[PDB]
Design a protein around this nucleic acid. Structure first.
Lengths: 298, 55, 458, 50
RNA sequence: GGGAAGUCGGCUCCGUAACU
């Protein structure tokens, strides 16, 4: 008894096969625009309960099973064997002039005898649903089938490629991780006017495959004369305005860090000197605005 | 509020959203309707088609 | 033969991993060793083979990393799925990153692996590491080279934009397309801008609205920096892209796009004839929006500033002979049809077709006569073929000009006015129809009689 | 001139300071000797010649 | 479900033969 079985008793669903169908339809949405669902091997009626919970109160649900299904509202159920002519005549009488929109299959044999035989029984039962899909489904319909993964799953998938346009194989997470079932959903029924009998024969399908160049030096000196710092431009503003003359600039240039050696000394000595010889001079907002215009590029 | 006359013969307000389309839209659980311009659904015509003709 | 022997073990791997993929993780590893031996024919035959293998084995749901009989049997197969599938991608990433050209007999490693990746990314979406499959597609779309594999990736991406209902793969794609061109410098061949147009999600509810909210905000910010970038051919796709998807985002932001293109008009007024005309049918398309015309009472969207721009530029558009050059609303290259789709939208609006001001009809038709003087032949008939439709719909409101008894005598006509109502065309009659009889009779004169016959028929 | 002012805005001169001259309406520009004096004051390697 | 109320409620297609 797992979580999905406990949710089946809480929500009133008959089995956990219901919760694989809704989460399959939540992935695709093939039940919200359908009138007819042909439910094959529908025991105990969980797939009919989902199909009843999602359609119109004027649409037709037909469930076929070998076991008697308890009556469900808005669902018509009857007991017949799906491989028999009496079954397809009963479905035809129920369908009258209406074709199936979705065909579902929840088939599973009585497992316990042998794994190869049970998978082969599951593979052929999925195929008995496959020819039942072919004449009942409307064009563009949906075919969803439960099948165990086995050697013939390649062959069953190949026929699905032939008869259907878009086909996916998907594990619902609501299904058992231990179980080897896989759900194959087929969309876009091509509506062929002639179907190959060997494409619908279990014996054929499951068969095992075998001049002037003198330049003066002025473009390098000019960046060294060009003003960079705000203190130098403040001195430039003081020189431009009638405040300080040449003699005042030389005298103010005579700070404590003059008459020093800056050529024959190593790079690390002069780098430490250059970091630690900067004097603090007053600045002006006019010089700060003008150096912002100077530093403003295109 | 503009006042009109309904099918019941009682003076009903003009813009009244009763709830029948909302009931219609889960009665068959249709999705959103098309806007003007989008293609018809070949499903939606055959779900609600016309009858044989004698009504 | 080694190739025939390698084909036999490849089919044996392919059959066993498709009959029952559970029992053989060592088949997956040996398939990687066959996929890693360096024989070029084997590399082609391998890559296509376990591309279809992972097309058949990848489940419909995501699998978390393990971290930390039959249950442990499943997880060991589960980690075997992700590690083997992940080992596809750097192998595919290195295959994509290698050189294309070789002998002409076949596509050695580039076009075949790119076709395999494009087919794989048309099914991977729901699974993880799609971004690594996407980052290959960003890398190839970044090479700026038109190729068969280029249009393959473009067709592969535009399938996902037209198929992914959840949109998580669409969201991961457009995020990388934004990261494509913030890293680079506005150098697409405009292809991803049309890939924004085939997105369906622009055209569960709370998660989907959050998914819409992310894809609407980031992709419009992508065109926002394109307008700042000012790339001319990228403008045509962006203005085509902005014309479709402008009604989703809120009131103030959508009115800001009009103010954004108004600044683009001022930037052009500071090539420029085309860029204004690219912006011309754009703003006429936003008003042409049915929800936006229903938002005429939910926003002021007014064009009376913009017609005056066309009126003062009808002289300059007549002077330029660059009108003809080498289902789209905005991205048409020639300014002849751009002028038509402009001048159709001005004198024949879709909504309120008969509610047009009179001086706008008198002035634009008079300047249309001036356009009928300085224009080439192909633009002439369509300019002609437009203006019967103007008269046949309006009639007596404009017929005052052709008849001199219906002429107002307020003040003399001013042909160079800054406003449409500034000129007073009711004083001048129309004589340029006579000048067009002197124009080539066989074609132009036909429309002239059709213009005058519908005029008398009114 | 408008073209001269546009060229000055794109590439400012060496003596440009952004200051209006109190003597003339044209903006004041530093001379070559004045610009060399500012550089020698800022660097301090040779404040006074010879 | 019933009674009441309001209404204007109850009292063409297939096959066959010549013609385009």
């Amino acid at each position: 008894l797992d979580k999905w079985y406990k949710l089946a008793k809480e929500k009133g669903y008959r089995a956990r096969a219901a919760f694989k169908l809704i989460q399959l339809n939540k992935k695709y949405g093939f039940l919200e625009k359908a009138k007819v669902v042909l439910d094959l091997c529908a025991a105990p009626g969980s797939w009919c309960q989902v199909c009843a919970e999602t359609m119109p109160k004027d649409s037709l649900i037909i469930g076929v099973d070998l076991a008697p299904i308890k009556p469900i509202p808005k669902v018509i159920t009857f007991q017949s064997d799906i491989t028999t002519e009496k079954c397809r005549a009963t479905i035809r009488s129920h369908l009258k002039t209406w074709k199936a929109d979705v065909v579902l299959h929840d088939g599973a044999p009585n497992v316990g005898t042998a794994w190869v035989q049970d998978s082969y029984n599951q593979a052929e039962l999925a195929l008995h649903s496959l020819k039942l899909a072919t004449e009942f489904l409307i064009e563009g319909g949906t075919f969803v089938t439960k099948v165990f993964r086995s050697k013939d799953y390649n062959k069953l998938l190949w026929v699905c490629n032939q008869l259907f346009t878009k086909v996916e194989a998907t594990k619902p997470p609501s299904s058992r991780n231990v179980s080897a079932e896989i759900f194959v959903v087929c969309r876009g029924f091509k509506a062929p006017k002639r179907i190959d009998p060997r494409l619908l024969d279990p014996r054929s399908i499951f068969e095992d495959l075998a001049w002037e160049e003198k330049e003066k030096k002025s473009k390098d000196g000019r960046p060294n004369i060009d003003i960079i710092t705000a203190e130098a431009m403040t001195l430039a503003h003081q020189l431009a305005t009638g405040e300080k003359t040449k003699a005042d600039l030389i005298d103010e240039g005579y700070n404590k860090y003059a008459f020093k050696q800056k050529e024959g000394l190593p790079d690390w000595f002069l780098e430490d000197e250059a970091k630690h010889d900067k004097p603090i001079k007053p600045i002006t907002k006019e010089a700060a605005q003008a150096i912002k215009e100077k530093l403003r590029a295109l | 509020v503009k006042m009109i006359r309904g099918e019941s013969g009682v003076k009903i307000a003009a813009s009244f959203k009763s709830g029948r389309f909302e009931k219609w839209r889960q009665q068959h659980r249709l999705g959103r309707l098309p806007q003007v311009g989008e293609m018809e659904k070949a499903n939606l015509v055959r779900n609600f088609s016309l009858p044989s003709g004698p009504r | 033969e080694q190739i025939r022997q390698a084909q036999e073990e490849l089919a044996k791997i392919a059959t066993q991993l498709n009959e029952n993929p559970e029992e053989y993780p060592g088949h997956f590893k040996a398939l990687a060793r066959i996929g890693e031996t360096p024989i070029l024919a084997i590399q082609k035959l391998c890559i296509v083979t376990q591309m279809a293998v992972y097309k058949d084995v990848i489940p419909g749901y995501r699998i978390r990393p393990l971290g930390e009989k039959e249950v442990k049997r499943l997880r060991t197969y589960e980690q075997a799925l992700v590690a083997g599938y992940h080992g596809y991608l750097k192998t595919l990433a290195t295959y994509a990153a290698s050189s294309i050209p070789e002998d002409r007999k076949g596509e050695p490693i580039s076009s075949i692996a790119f076709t395999c990746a494009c087919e794989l990314v048309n099914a991977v979406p729901h699974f993880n590491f799609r971004g690594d499959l996407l980052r290959i597609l960003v890398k190839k779309l970044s090479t700026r080279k038109i190729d068969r594999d280029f249009v393959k990736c473009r067709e592969a991406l535009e399938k996902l934009f037209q198929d992914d209902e959840e949109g998580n793969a669409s969201q991961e794609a457009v995020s990388l397309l934004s990261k494509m061109m913030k890293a680079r410098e506005y150098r697409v061949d405009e292809s991803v801008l049309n890939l924004f147009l085939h997105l369906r999600l622009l055209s569960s509810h709370e998660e989907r609205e959050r998914i819409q909210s992310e894809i609407l905000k980031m992709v419009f910010a992508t065109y926002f920096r394109i307008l700042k970038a000012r790339v001319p051919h990228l403008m045509g796709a962006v203005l085509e892209g902005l014309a479709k998807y402008a009604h989703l985002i809120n009131q103030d932001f959508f009115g800001d796009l009009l103010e954004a293109l108004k600044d683009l008009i001022r930037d052009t007024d500071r090539d420029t004839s085309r860029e204004s005309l690219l912006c011309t049918v754009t703003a006429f398309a936003l008003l042409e929006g049915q929800d936006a015309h229903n938002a005429r009472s939910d926003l002021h969207l007014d064009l009376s500033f913009f017609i005056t721009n066309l009126y003062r530029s009808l002289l300059s558009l007549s002077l330029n002979p660059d009108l003809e050059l080498g289902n789209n609303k905005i991205n048409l290259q020639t300014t002849t049809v751009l002028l038509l789709r402009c001048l159709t939208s001005v004198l024949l609006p879709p909504w309120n077709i008969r509610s047009v001001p009179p001086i706008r009809l008198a002035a634009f038709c008079k300047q249309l006569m001036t356009l009928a003087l300085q224009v080439p032949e192909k633009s002439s008939q369509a300019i002609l073929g437009l203006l019967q439709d103007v008269v046949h719909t309006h009639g007596r409101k404009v017929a005052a000009l052709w008849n001199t008894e219906e002429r107002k005598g307020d003040g003399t006509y001013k042909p160079l006015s800054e406003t449409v109502e500034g000129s007073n065309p009711f004083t001048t009659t129309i004589w340029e129809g006579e000048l067009l009889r002197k124009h080539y009779c066989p074609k132009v004169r036909e429309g002239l009689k059709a213009m005058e016959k519908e005029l008398r028929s009114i | 001139d408008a073209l001269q002012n546009l060229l000055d805005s794109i590439e400012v001169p060496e003596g440009w300071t952004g200051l209006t001259d109190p003597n003339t309406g044209k903006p004041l520009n530093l001379s070559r000797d004045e610009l060399e004096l500012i550089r020698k004051v800022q660097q301090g390697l040779i404040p006074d010649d010879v």
